[PDB]
Curated annotation (Swiss-Prot):
Changing residue 155 to Q: Decreases binding to DBN1. It is linked to Mutations in ZMYND8 may be the cause of syndromic intellectual disability with variable cardiovascular, ophthalmologic and minor skeletal anomalies. This is MYND-type zinc finger-containing chromatin reader ZMYND8. Zn(2+) 1 binds at residues 6, 9, 26, 29. The chain holds residues 86 to 403 of 1186 of the full protein. GO terms for molecular function: DNA-binding transcription factor binding; histone H3K14ac reader activity; histone H3K4me1 reader activity; methylated histone binding; protein domain specific binding; transcription corepressor activity; zinc ion binding. Chromatin reader that recognizes dual histone modifications such as histone H3.1 dimethylated at 'Lys-36' and histone H4 acetylated at 'Lys-16' (H3.1K36me2-H4K16ac) and histone H3 methylated at 'Lys-4' and histone H4 acetylated at 'Lys-14' (H3K4me1-H3K14ac). May act as a transcriptional corepressor for KDM5D by recognizing the dual histone signature H3K4me1-H3K14ac. May also act as a transcriptional corepressor for KDM5C and EZH2. Changing residue 222 to L: Found in a patient with syndromic intellectual disability; uncertain significance; disrupts interaction with DBN1. Changing residue 206 to R: Found in a patient with syndromic intellectual disability; uncertain significance; disrupts interaction with DBN1. Changing residue 222 to A: Severely decreases interaction with histone H3.1K36me2.
Length: 313
């Protein structure tokens, strides 16, 4: 049965109906070039469609099976199920809220989410977040937007959003971070992240993994403390023997980070057989291949075809 409350603003009124799911939307809340005809898939269903399409799925998703994703979603639910999320951990009981089903046509809770994930019902992170969002929508409808429960539901979704985003950035990093085995941060990924010197305004030059590029910013994960930041691409250099010098007050901390990095370099060398340090102050460029070149003096020869076409919880 279709919902009566707009998925965007959580209010009733004249609402559009999705063909593919029970969500409904005020035309106005969608900021359209014009209202639809006849075939309309909502923005949630559009997103999920674009994502679960083999040829336009994300690096993360192309890497992942449904089953592998379900294992990762299990970790994400554990993050969502923090202390103080009591109200949303099990289905709302009718004994306490006898009129709940007059307002809420599509109940959801964290336990249901977990069971659904285990049953391999989610084909992508997008589908998981969209389903989790019923918790927040429902809470706002029934309790009110300013109710204290809504604060808690908002945090649950913000946690979900963060976790989904992290899976999408790199599922292998995510799994590593979840299990926290020793030197998890030194374990190379199947498509290894470039090592850079990264300088954030206000901070000393520091070793990091470059996880992605977006609009001239690099998603840098720093050795040592395992902090993170977007770093301007022009402030990122490929890793070199010579260190770009910064005054600092944290000498043992820097040493620890450099130690960690050298383990990582040893691991990359072990797993892929190469690692190329670059000349001092070599700009990092998007999707940099340099560190993996067979012969760094011959970029046209590229990386070594060493894959055997082969394919940890
Ligand atoms: Zn609306
Ligand atoms: Zn839909
Ligand atoms: Zn990774």
């Amino acid at each position: 049965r279709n919902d009566f409350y707009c998925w965007v603003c959580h209010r009733e009124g004249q609402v559009l109906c999705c063909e593919l799911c029970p969500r409904v939307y005020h035309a106005k809340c969608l900021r359209l070039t014009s209202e639809p005809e006849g075939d309309w898939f909502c923005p949630e269903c559009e997103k999920i469609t674009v994502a679960e399409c083999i040829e336009t799925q994300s690096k993360a998703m192309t890497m992942l099976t449904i089953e592998q994703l379900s294992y990762l979603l299990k970790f994400a639910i554990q993050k969502m199920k923090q202390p103080g999320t009591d109200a949303f951990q099990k289905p709302v009981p009718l004994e306490q809220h006898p009129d709940y089903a007059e307002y809420i046509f599509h109940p959801m809770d964290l336990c249901t989410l977990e069971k659904n994930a285990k049953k391999k019902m989610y084909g992508c992170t997008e589908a998981f977040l969209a389903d989790a969002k019923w918790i927040l929508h429902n809470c706002i409808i029934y309790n009110g937007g300013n109710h204290k429960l809504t604060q808690i539901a908002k945090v649950v979704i913000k946690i979900c959003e963060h976790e989904m985003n992290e899976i999408e950035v790199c599922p292998e990093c995510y799994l590593a971070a979840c299990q926290k085995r020793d030197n998890w941060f030194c374990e190379p990924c199947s498509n290894p992240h470039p090592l850079v010197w990264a300088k954030l305004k206000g901070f000393p030059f520091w070793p990091a993994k470059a996880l992605r590029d977006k609009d001239g910013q690099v998603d840098a994960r720093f050795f040592g403390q395992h902090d993170r930041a977007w770093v301007p691409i022009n402030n990122c250099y490929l890793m070199s023997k010579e260190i770009p010098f910064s005054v600092k007050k944290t000498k043992s901390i820097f040493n620890s980070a450099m130690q960690e990095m050298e383990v990582y370099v040893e691991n990359i060398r072990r797993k892929f057989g190469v690692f190329n340090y670059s000349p001092f102050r070599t700009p990092y460029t998007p999707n940099s291949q340099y560190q993996m070149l067979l012969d760094p003096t011959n970029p046209s020869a590229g990386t070594a075809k060493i894959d055997k076409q082969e394919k940890d919880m």
